[PDB]
Design a protein around this nucleic acid. Sequence first.
RNA 1: GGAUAAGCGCUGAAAGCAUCUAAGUGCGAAGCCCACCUCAAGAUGAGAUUACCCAUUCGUAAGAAUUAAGAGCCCAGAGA
RNA 2: GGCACCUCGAUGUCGGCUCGUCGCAUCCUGGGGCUGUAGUCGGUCCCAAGGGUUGGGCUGUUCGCCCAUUAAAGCGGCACGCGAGCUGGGUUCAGAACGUCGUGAGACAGUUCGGUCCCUAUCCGUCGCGGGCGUAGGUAAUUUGAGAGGAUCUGUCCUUA
Lengths: 58, 147, 205, 36, 174
Amino acid sequence: WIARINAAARMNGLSYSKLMHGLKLADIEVNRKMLADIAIADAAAFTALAEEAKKALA
Amino acid sequence: MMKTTFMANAQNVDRKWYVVDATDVPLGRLSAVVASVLRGKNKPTYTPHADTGDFVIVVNAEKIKLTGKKATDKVYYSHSLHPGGLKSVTAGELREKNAVRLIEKSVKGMLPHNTLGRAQGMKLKVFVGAEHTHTAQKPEVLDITGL
Amino acid sequence: SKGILGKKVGMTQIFTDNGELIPVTVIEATPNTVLQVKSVETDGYEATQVGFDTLREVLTNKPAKGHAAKANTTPKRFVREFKGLEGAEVGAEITVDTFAAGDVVDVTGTSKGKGFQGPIKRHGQSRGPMAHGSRYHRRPGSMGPVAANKVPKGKKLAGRMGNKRVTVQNLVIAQVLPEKNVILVKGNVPGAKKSLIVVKSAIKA
Amino acid sequence: KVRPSVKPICEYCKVIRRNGRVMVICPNPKHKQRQG
Amino acid sequence: SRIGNKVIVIPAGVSVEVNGATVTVKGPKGELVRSFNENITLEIAENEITVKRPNDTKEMKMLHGTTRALLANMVEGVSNGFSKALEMIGVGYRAQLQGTKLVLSVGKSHQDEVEAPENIKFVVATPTSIVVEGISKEAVGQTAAYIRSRRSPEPYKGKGIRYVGEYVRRKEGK
RNA sequence: GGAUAAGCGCUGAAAGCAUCUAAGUGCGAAGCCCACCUCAAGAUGAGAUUACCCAUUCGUAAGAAUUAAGAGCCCAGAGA
RNA sequence: GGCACCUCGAUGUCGGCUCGUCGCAUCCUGGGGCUGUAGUCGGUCCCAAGGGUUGGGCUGUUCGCCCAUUAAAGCGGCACGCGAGCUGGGUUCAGAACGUCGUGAGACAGUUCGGUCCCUAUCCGUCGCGGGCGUAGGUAAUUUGAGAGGAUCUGUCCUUA
């Protein structure tokens, strides 16, 4: 779960620790492993929730 | 409930090719991330039996940014099974001759030591001063940094 | 550079000059049958895979008459190599009278096949004592130190023996008294009965 | 020559860490103090 | 220090290429070339040289002060070109000229020679008194070291090749 | 041969000197490695070269069965 | 020496024969320094384990001694190397004897004679020769060489003089 999601996060150049850190910074979602399950075909869910984390670190 | 996992790769694998080089790049910092790509660990599709073994290409492999006097005190070893089997390839030596196992033995130290690790680890693509060969397929140059 | 394509007929002794009884030997000195040069480009080495011994129809093969393909004519039996070359023709070349590596000849043979032997018989350790109420004689000795639960390799202990080619150095004959069909050599030239004795020279010289 | 505890012997001597070895430079062939 | 702060004049048109070790010096020997420091912090000035420092620790300033001495050795090395002291003291230790790889005669069952790759400019004044010429002090001193490398002097009487000072401390016996 | 250990070098730098060293350059051993000989592509990366057969019949999907080039059985004997 | 932690439903413990291997605190051969070394011969240490490191007499036994030697006559480790390889001179049966001790039964490593050492290789490991497959055709010859081994020693005399 976490390995493939830091694989796609690292494909966006993002590291798991600051991503998750942006997830605690982030919304009501602290949802973990379904958020790992978006490894299939989710630039919208994956990179957009990544942008939610970008406005959570921001 | 039960099968929320997904391999999505364990038959339908990918095959991609990467010229990866810097003429002088340090050995460890190149080595573990080219290890990561030869896993395909950076690819978002990991399976413990993924076989995302990347075509990890290196050319022009003359130099490590060699910190300290490592070309004088790196010295390697080996042991033939004949008793008293010390045979040592040493530090700066055979770098200038054949800097191949100067890399991929250390990437054997990188890899998961198993049949898949020896699969892609024994599917490296290694050139030391070259413009390599067989660009019939499509190669792509990967990064510079240690990321 | 040494077309020494040939066998011996045996081992003798003759006085040659100012008397000097010398253990003397010979090679049959059949005409050399050397193929093309086969330079470094197609194959990184230099040598010639020289053909020899002139078969009849039976002992051949379509890669043997088919070696008279990429040769020109006359399929042969034996093929060796010689690095150090002159080169004349693709298939068959010039005979015994030229010598171009040295007269301390470092002669190469394929030793007499004496078979499986005793432990001493060529491994040369001490045979055990006979007398004085001890069972131990004709058995080579212990080999494993106790600190490992192993035995080492490397120590010669037995072995079916004899078909082992040897390249002995500096066999001593001068510029050979030739013939159409002789080569004088000296004494215990290695090999066996009906064994080809081809030889390059001066590798320690 | 060899003594690991190098202390000065002749006046106007020199103490070197040549190649990481503390050798001794004097004008006399008698004492030429090897570090060890 | 008190070297790199000071200046080295470059008279007679030394013709330096400022690129790298490409620094070439000009004299009666002509246009020769030795080295640079590494490639950097070498401000080759004009009519003199004022090589700057990037920092003043013993790696930083001190090792281009090294090359103030080295390009100094190019300047005054090419200015004439010279040699060291060399005299073959011995009761039969004679030396003569055989072309340019010339004869030095200890008395061994081999015969001794001198070879220089680019600069002998040479004279045997006599089998006692010899001198060579080179341009680099390094080439000179390693060359005269090669002269030392076939017969050394003694602690007992005059042998080997002379350098004007050795403080011989000649031992005795009997 | 080359890299050298130890040791001995030139120039040199804090330290204007000095200084075999810090860069930079040498010399230097039965050590090491290559070179001398042998085993050696099951060296799975399984090499590279030389030649030959070629590209068959059966729905052949699957295969099956010929058969080339051969290779072998079988026999004789030993240089083994 | 000490230690009692495995070994009492078995860890056979001397010495030797055979067969070795490594270590270096290097015995010789290699280089180099210093010398209270004129050399010759020496002392001395630094780097060095490539190779080699004698044969007999006596001592069951180590150590040690003698002879004659060479390049030298190294030191150790390895179940004081190795008994499913071996011997059995040594305690380590029972005998018998002495000396000495104990009334005695016996004892005291104090001596000495004699004294009872099996294994038909299953695995791993060794040595040598094979089959089955592979090396995107079946073959048949050729070799390169990734790698692995072997081997390395040493006088003597003359010249230089």
